[PDB]
Amino acid sequence: NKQKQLISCGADGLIKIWDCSSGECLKTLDGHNNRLWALSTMNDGDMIVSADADGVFQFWKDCEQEIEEEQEKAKLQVEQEQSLQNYMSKGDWTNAFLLAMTLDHPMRLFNVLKRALGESRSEVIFNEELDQAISILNDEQLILLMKRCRDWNTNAKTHTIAQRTIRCILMHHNIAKLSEIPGMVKIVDAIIPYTQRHFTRVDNLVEQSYILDYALVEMDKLF
């Protein structure tokens, strides 16, 4: 009907369509199975009706609604990227984190978490609203966030962030759900040993703090 995307049947049991001036096949349709004998076109509503060797009919119709919804997605993405940018600019780390998870921007999510700890250094682990958001988090969102925490924990300088998020998840999620989520065991097994490492290192720092105490004791004894 468009006089451009001319169409061809095929006894292989499939249709393929292409622009007349193109010379290369655009779209392939494989509804039918065995053969295909009869092919007809409704013009004013460009509908393709195909009948095969068997007694099965198929009706087909083009859509530009695909283009409309694609443009919808692009518009929505740009809007929410601006939302995230302005959020990191002004505050509202709860909103910023929501959008960062919805878009998957590891830098922006990580900075959000670091700033959240900074402002939360003054039970509660973050802004109460942020904690509620983590509570309402989804399953694939949980797997993505815990993967990110796994990497940030592999690092040495960012384990504070990673541990803080993991603790928040544990205190605001259901352990049955976490065990049940697929792959979660692989993620957790990756996480643990680095956590043990950081545990020991922090312990030794406490020990040296007691060195400082000793210096105090001797100073007082001299005084």
Partner 1 sequence: YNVGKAEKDGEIRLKNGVAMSKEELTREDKNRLRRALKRKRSKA
Partner 2 sequence: YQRFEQAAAFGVIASNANCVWIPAPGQLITSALEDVNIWDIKTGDLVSKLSDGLPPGASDARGAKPAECTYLEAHKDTDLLAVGYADGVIKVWDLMSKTVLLNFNGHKAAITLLQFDGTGTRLISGSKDSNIIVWDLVGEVGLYKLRSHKDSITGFWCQGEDWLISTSKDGMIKLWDLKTHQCIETHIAHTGECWGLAVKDDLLITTGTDSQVKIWKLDIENDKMGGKLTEMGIFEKQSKQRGLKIEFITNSFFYIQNADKTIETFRIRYSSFILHPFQTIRSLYKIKSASWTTVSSSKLELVLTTSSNTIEYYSIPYEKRDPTSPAPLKTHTIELQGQRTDVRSIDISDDNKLLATASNGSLKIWNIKTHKCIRTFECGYALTCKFLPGGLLVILGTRNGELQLFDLASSSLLDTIEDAHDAAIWSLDLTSDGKRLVTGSADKTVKFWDFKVLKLHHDTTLELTDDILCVRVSPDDRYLAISLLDNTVKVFFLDSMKFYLSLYGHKLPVLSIDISFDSKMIITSSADKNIKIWGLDFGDCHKSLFAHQDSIMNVKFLPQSHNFFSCSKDAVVKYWDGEKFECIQKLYAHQSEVWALAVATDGGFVVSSSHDHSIRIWEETSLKAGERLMEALDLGIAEIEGLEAYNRDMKNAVLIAVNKTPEQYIMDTLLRIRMSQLEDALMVMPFSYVLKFLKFIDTVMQNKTLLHSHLPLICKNLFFIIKFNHKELVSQKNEELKLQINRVKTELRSALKSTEDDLGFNVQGLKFVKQQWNLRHNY
Residues in the chain: 223
Among 46, 72, 104, 218, binds partner 1 (CB under 8 A): 104
Using the Cα atoms of residue 186, residue 188, residue 189 and residue 190 in order, give the sign of their dihedral: positive
The C-alpha angle with vertex 97 and arms to 95 and 100, in degrees rounded to 5, equals 110
Task: Give the nearer residue to partner 2 in terms of CB position, either 44 or 207.
Answer: 207
Question: Given the DSSP bridges, would you call strands 27-29 and 38-42 parallel, antiparallel or unpaired?
Answer: unpaired
Is 158 among the residues that bind partner 1 (CB under 8 A)?
yes
State which residue, 34 or 77, has the beta carbon closest to partner 1.
77
Residue 145 CA to residue 186 CA, distance in Å, equals: 14
What does 65 interact with, of partner 2, partner 1, none (CB < 5 to 8 A by kind)? Answer: none
d(CA 136, CA 166): 15
Q: Does 150 bind partner 1 (CB under 8 A)?
A: yes
Give the three-state DSSP class for 108: helix
Binding mask 108-147 for partner 1 (x = CB under 8 A): x-x-------------------------------------
Interface ranges with partner 2 (CB under 8 A): 71, 74-75, 78-79, 81-83, 85-86, 89, 117-118, 121-122, 157, 159-160, 163-164, 166-167, 170, 175, 178-179, 184-185, 188-189, 191-192, 195-196, 198-199, 202-203, 205-206, 208-209, 211-213, 215-216, 218-220, 222-223
What is the identity of the amino acid at 65? Q
The residues near 2 (Cβ < 8 Å, ≥ 6 apart) are 46
Q: Does 107 bind partner 1 (CB under 8 A)?
A: yes
List binders of partner 1 among 184-213 (CB under 8 A). 190
**What gap in Å lies between CA 9 and CA 144, rounded to an integer?**
45
For partner 1, which is the closer residue by CB, 32 or 108? 108
Residue 192, classed as helix, strand or coil, is: helix
Among residues 88, 122, 125, 135, which one has the least CA distance to residue 108? Answer: 88
155 scored as a contact of partner 1 (CB under 8 A)? yes
**Residue numbers of the site for partner 1 (CB under 8 A)?**
81, 103-108, 110, 148, 150-155, 158, 190
